[PDB]
Design a protein around this nucleic acid. Sequence first.
RNA 1: UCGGCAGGAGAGGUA
DNA 2: GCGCATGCTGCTCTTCAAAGCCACGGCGACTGCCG
DNA 3: CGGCAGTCGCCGTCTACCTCTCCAAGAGCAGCATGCGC
Lengths: 49, 195, 48, 49, 110
Amino acid sequence: SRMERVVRERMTTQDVEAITPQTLINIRPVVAAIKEFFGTSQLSQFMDQ
Amino acid sequence: APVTHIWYFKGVPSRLGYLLDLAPKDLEKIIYFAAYVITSVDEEMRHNELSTLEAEMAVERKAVEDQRDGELEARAQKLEADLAELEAEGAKADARRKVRDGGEREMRQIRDRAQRELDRLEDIWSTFTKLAPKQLIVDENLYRELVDRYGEYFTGAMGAESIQKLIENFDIDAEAESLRDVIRNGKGQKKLRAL
Amino acid sequence: LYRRVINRNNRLKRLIDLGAPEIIVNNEKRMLQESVDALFDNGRRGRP
Amino acid sequence: QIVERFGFSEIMRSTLEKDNTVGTDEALLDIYRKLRPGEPPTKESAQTL
Amino acid sequence: KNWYVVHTYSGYENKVKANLEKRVESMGMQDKIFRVVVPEEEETDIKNGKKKVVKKKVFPGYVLVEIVMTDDSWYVVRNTPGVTGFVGSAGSGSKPTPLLPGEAETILKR
RNA sequence: UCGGCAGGAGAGGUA
DNA sequence: GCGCATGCTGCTCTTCAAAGCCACGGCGACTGCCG
DNA sequence: CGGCAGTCGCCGTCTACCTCTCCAAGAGCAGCATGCGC
């Protein structure tokens, strides 16, 4: 959803005929969310062995 | 710019509101730039300039009435003339009844415009006759008008500098003996408020 | 919270000593008041 | 319609004869000056809210 | 109906001006906004001849914008990637207060 | 004689 | 073979958006609100 | 004007000890470095 908001906001400030799917997509929010869940979270717990 | 300590205004109760005799909502509006307040009022010049200002106000009252009746007479002239010259020569007089209602709504258009103006003048005057210190006033429009026409004799602003001004012009003894007099001979809930 | 107060105070000083219209100065004064209020007690009024 | 459907019970009759808002546009305005305070109520915004 | 004010970030004035001028047409409201002016003043200064002209914005953080305002105008000039709000209000910002003729003229003339 | 360090948040446990 | 022009990744700097979110008991002021 | 009752916001909720992991991000802006053309 964050990436979708970014692409929607950036689709209206660029010039047409030079817009490609690779220039509209930002990966940083998704990897940030993934690495924040798998790290500092209350449900992904240190395993006891 | 001066600021206000949070401990002495956002408490239970509000000590600043108890000292200045102001509701906490009024204090919150004044401090955070959402309403005006009247710090001081020179009552001698609003005593000896009263009837003179009232006479100028009656001059504008009469001039607005004269304007209204002037263009109502000239609109009824145009009406009478055109209507009697073109009383549905070809078609049905329902069109001239539609423009009968439309001419009645033209008279009431200029009549409600003169009523609106009368109300503006009335409220301006009323506010300029009931202006005591520590009285909160909202609506930028009115304030600006009062400061344009009757600029002097009335002073006030918004922000913490106007509460510093209210605190500086404060008399502890008079309020203290007033509260003691109220508690001494009083009942109901005003005695509780004084306590 | 000190850095915020200093930044708002510096911007207010520079804007006051420039001849700015009243609306902008009032906005800056409100923002400085909020910053000081948050410095002394954070969360008492509004959101933290 | 309401009284025809919710007439087997009496609490709905009571509520019916004490709303004083008969009208979908004025009911839209009613909940508009409730969910969005301070804002000026326009039937179109209440319809969309 | 008159010149209003908008509040951008620190240093984000020319990007708000650019994004707004692009979204004037790209969006579709070409008859609402008219002129976008980022207040700026030529700071007289030289370093032994080499000039700099510091971009001393006469109002650091704000961008006056002449516009008509009804419904969609508030929306377009509030979601631009950079603007923070419509600085100017009577307590609840229900109808932003416009700049006063005089001050507006003496700002545009500087 | 140079030279030389110690804050917050979350989770799980024992009495 | 030399001169021009255009993009590497470290470093620096500055903070409103906006959805996301959903115990319990005691007390005291207070505030619209009905009457 | 005058009671008034609901409402909302602000206070308080046992002591000592052990082990582990994680801590702003994005965008602009350098001072060079490598390719292409005559």
